[PDB]
Amino acid sequence: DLSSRVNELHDLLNQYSYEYYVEDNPSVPDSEYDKLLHELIKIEEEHPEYKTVDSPTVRVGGEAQASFNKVNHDTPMLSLGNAFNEDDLRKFDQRIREQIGNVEYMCELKIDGLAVSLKYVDGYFVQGLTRGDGTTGEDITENLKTIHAIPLKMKEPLNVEVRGEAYMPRRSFLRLNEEKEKNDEQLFANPRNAAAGSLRQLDSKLTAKRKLSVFIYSVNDFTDFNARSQSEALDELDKLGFTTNKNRARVNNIDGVLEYIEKWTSQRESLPYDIDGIVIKVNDLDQQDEMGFTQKSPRWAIAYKFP
């Protein structure tokens, strides 16, 4: 045998899933996607030799449970300093400009979700961890596999650990809380709590019924990337098959940063997801190196927090 129909079904399902979940521009209706997926599930039931580690059927969840084992990240995740106003951002920019000159900033939305590390070996998704304390997180790989915005296989066979924010889109949170109201159940307080509850299921089939997504914001190691900057690294992640947040911007200076924060204070309610802040980074990777660290935090990144 059935190799021709199985390979055709993988190609069509992977294309349509990407178009819908990553591009929000489906070329087919859900009835067509659902029909093709059921056909592939039926082939794999009756002919299990066609099951693959990266099959589209992985998204529906299965029998293996996430272990929730304590596992160290290959590289500890960053702990960022905070900013609460325009003055903190001017101070951040002053200490950079006093040390390394006038630099470019990358600005991005800080997604109100669950921070995750996603490890790829030979281009295949093999391990997904919660942030935990930044060094050690919980193994939730089986549940994370159900999120369509996470690629099961990258376009190049790299060994990398990407960092992202898993979240529930706001309209899916609101619709879920309506259901909970109707079964006399306790509502989730916010999308973040709903996404946390979804990823803590013992059964990945339960996680799969919840509508989750991700945005990838960084990688542990840039050795296999041609990116010379944070903004080029996110463009490269796009080419490699990840889901990144399109609202990132390169700005020349502190005025550009303040304008970006000003824009998104007014525009954040219109977004289909919750944001808790904005992350500003020195864009150039070598300049990030030149800036170095405090005892705990990068001197080249700051998280602006909304009031």
Query: Residue 181, annotated ligand binder?
Result: no
Query: Residue 98, annotated ligand binder?
Result: no
Q: Phi-psi category of 208—alpha, beta or left, where left has phi over 0 and alpha has psi -120 to 50?
A: alpha
Q: What is the DSSP letter of 229?
A: B
d(CA 71, CA 195): 21
Query: Residue 165, annotated ligand binder?
Result: yes
Query: Residue 34, annotated ligand binder?
Result: yes
Q: What is the DSSP letter of 284?
A: B
Selection from 162, 168, 152 nearest residue 117 by Cα = 162
Query: Residue 167, annotated ligand binder?
Result: no
Query: Residue 39, annotated ligand binder?
Result: no
Burial of 256 (0-12, 13-18, 19+ CB in 10 A): middle
Query: Residue 281, annotated ligand binder?
Result: yes
Q: Is 263 a catalytic residue?
A: no
Q: Cα angle vertex 143, ends 138, 144, to 5°?
A: 85
Query: Residue 296, annotated ligand binder?
Result: no
Query: Residue 30, annotated ligand binder?
Result: yes
Chain-centre distance for alpha carbon 19:
17
Beta bridge pairs of residue 121: 124
Q: What is the DSSP letter of 49?
A: G
- Token digits for 214? 């991700």
Query: Residue 276, annotated ligand binder?
Result: no
Given 42, 110, 153, 263, the catalytic residue: 110
Query: Residue 21, annotated ligand binder?
Result: no
Query: Residue 70, annotated ligand binder?
Result: no
d(CA 154, CA 120): 8
Annotated binding site: which residue ranges? 30-34, 79-80, 108, 131, 165, 281, 305
Residues acting as catalytic residues? 110
Annotated binding site for NAD(+): which residue ranges? 30-34, 79-80, 108, 131, 165, 281, 305
